[PDB]
From a paper:
Here we report the use of single particle cryo-EM to identify multiple proteins from three enriched heterogeneous fractions prepared from human liver [name] lysate. Using this approach, we were able to simultaneously identify and solve cryo-EM structures of nine different human [name] enzymes: short chain acyl-CoA dehydrogenase (SCAD), medium chain acyl-CoA dehydrogenase (MCAD), isovaleryl-CoA dehydrogenase (IVD), delta (3, 5)-delta dienoyl-CoA isomerase (ECH1), aspartate aminotransferase (GOT2), glutamate dehydrogenase (GLUD1), [name] superoxide dismutase 2 (SOD2), catalase (CAT), and [name] aldehyde dehydrogenase (ALDH2). Functionally, the three acyl-CoA dehydrogenases—SCAD, MCAD and IVD—are involved in beta oxidation and amino acid catabolism. Finally, SOD2, CAT, and ALDH2 are all involved in clearing toxic byproducts of oxidative respiration.
SOD2 is a manganese-binding member of the SOD family that is expressed in the mitochondria and catalyzes the oxidation of two O2− ions to molecular O2 and H2O2 (46). Our BaR methodology classified a total of 50,014 single particle projections for the SOD2 class. Based on these projections, we constructed a high-resolution density map of 2.91 Å. The global architecture of SOD2 is a homotetramer formed by a dimer of dimers. Similarly to existing crystal structures, each subunit of SOD2 contains an N-terminal domain primarily consisting of two long α helices and a C-terminal domain made up of a core three stranded β sheet flanked by a set of six α helices. A central cavity is formed by the interface of each subunit’s β-sheet core, while dimer interfaces consist of α-helical bundles from the N-terminal domains. Elements of both domains contribute to the Mn2+-binding site for each subunit.
Author numbering:
A (entry chain A), B (entry chain C), C (entry chain B), D (entry chain D): 25 to 222
């Protein structure tokens, strides 16, 4: 059984880019629902697997994918954001961005374009293609995890679900992205790239 | 080139079930963006078709589907809601609900379950299966139109996109559905069933 | 661990509608591969679930769905076909077809149209919608099981995968369907409807 | 209105890797059906677009995608195969394979794995990611074109549809791939890379 990961920072840490209400509602309601439904799906699905009902497993596949992907995506998202984060990434990760996207601003605009291009709910991901050994930009609809679906190891995540920004930015998602670029925890992305690149 | 259909009722007509801010933002921003992107996609796609580029047409298919389905779905949605609407449908449509779902409350709970079951963005639809000649409950993700995709002629539509209810009901979609059941324009659904059943 | 179900009839029973080579290759190779890959996916996926890796489970979901659906679909398919089968279904199932499709020939042409309409690999299904309590015609791509995906309890199945008919009928699938209508085991479909309707 | 492209080589040119029957049936039946259905879909869809029926366009989208993608994919496939082709690619394309996949044999095994991994019908593609400027391996189900869907400009294509190999290799697709590696027209792939890389 999974558990809800506590935020490393208080709800009002992301002022004013993300107001306290959005963080509070997001974490305490949407991620909590994801983890609770994940636990329910896990217990039902495990008893189905023990019974040996393939039809039941295939029926439960969408719910398990949705809840587990939501949990994983939001767990990555919370770590990816810091009150102290933002600005310009440093170290080998910056060089990787330079050699894969030409410049950091080009990476910013490409990730912003990918995030806005998500029709409906979804996620915009910066991930390390380990087999090819280079950074990539992806967009995954709904709560589809990056590593589970595409195989790319996730480094940076942007939640373009409407619950992430509607209470503050209404329909202008580009403003939400421009703001969230100020709270990215580039140190955590550096740790993820170090652990992934290795 | 398509145009944005004006609301038959003012923005504050749906008080208090749907506050004025949600109706105003929805109609003036989301549907306007859908119709504008639909016009852009139509002109680009028509010049591509005249040129005879199948690859360009297949590339433009997702954008055309998204924008056109959004326009159609919201155009149906605005007519489906009335300040005077709500309560209990009358006439042959009520008998059709009785003979297809057992009772009107059973239809209400089935449509509510279908609408809540939409993972992410989507739409919950009551539609007349014309070939089989009976009412059906469907759920279509994102802005997929009912008639275009499933072939069911749409009668009643519920927008479970987060922009439809987040500013008022936050994460509890069931409360949004319970409220929207008070503003359903059953007379327009009766007209749609008469024109469809015929 | 699952096992390959033996055919109730020998390979050459379906002469001349389905030649012995197609039945032999189908059962001994395609279904055997499905069940073997299903066993492998089950063991890998069960150890992943015991470990508690949601990402691994979501990664293994497509393979499990493909193999398990192939196994279930072919297990239903083998029972649905009999050397003695064919002709005109008798009993309450015939009345159900009459009241849901108008006539048996209308059901035949509707199921044939659904089977031919499958773009690529897939399956054409006659299934009892238990909640609505009436027969329905569905088409499921690749090896997607009917009950697992759509919830319809499967009664009759038609494999429109190219391995089912290419060695004999080449590209004309309609001839394959017209032939397979002579070997349908309507008694087994009657048993399935009795067990389902109940 | 599109037309069926004639084969640059006679039907029996690919002996013994691809027998004359497979080439004859493939080109004269499957691709002919694709182009005919593409013409029908184009005329219906163009009159729908002129009428201004978005629902009709969205309904016709799947058929247009299927037929047009089939036509494009098979038109690329016929050029990609030559009686004189096979062996080891020469020139800058070989260096591109070396720098993107490590060695030519690694590219061969990766493309073979991608082609076999296609569950059901599909296509395995070697394509130049123009934005990132490097070669990539992709798999597209059914008749989905590479450039239309993923944006990768197609260079080499492998038809893993069962009509491509079932009459000769039955269920062992790996043998079909090992054989088709002897008839790849690397000169045409070099031309495609030159025109794409530019
Ligand atoms: Mn979220
Ligand atoms: Mn809406
Ligand atoms: Mn089969
Ligand atoms: Mn082909």
């Amino acid at each position: 059984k999974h558990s809800l990961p506590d935020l490393p920072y208080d709800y009002g840490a992301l002022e004013p880019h993300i107001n306290a209400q959005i963080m509070q509602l997001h974490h305490s309601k949407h991620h909590a629902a994801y983890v609770n439904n994940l636990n329910v799906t896990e217990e039902k699905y495990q008893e189905a697997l023990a019974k040996g009902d393939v039809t039941a497993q295939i029926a439960l596949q969408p719910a398990l994918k949705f809840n587990g992907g939501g949990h994983i995506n939001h767990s990555i998202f919370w770590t990816n954001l810091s009150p102290n984060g933002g600005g310009e990434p440093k170290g080998e990760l910056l060089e990787a961005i330079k050699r894969d996207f030409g410049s950091f601003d080009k990476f910013k605009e490409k990730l912003t374009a990918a995030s806005v291009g998500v029709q409906g709910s979804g996620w915009g991901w910066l991930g390390f293609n380990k087999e090819r050994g280079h950074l990539q930009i992806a967009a995954c609809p709904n709560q589809d995890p990056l590593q589970g679906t595409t195989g790319l190891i996730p480094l940076l995540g942007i939640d373009v679900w409407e619950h992430a920004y509607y209470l503050q930015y209404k329909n202008v998602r580009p403003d939400y992205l421009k703001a969230i670029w100020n709270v990215i925890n580039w140190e955590n992305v550096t740790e993820r790239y170090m652990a992934c690149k290795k």
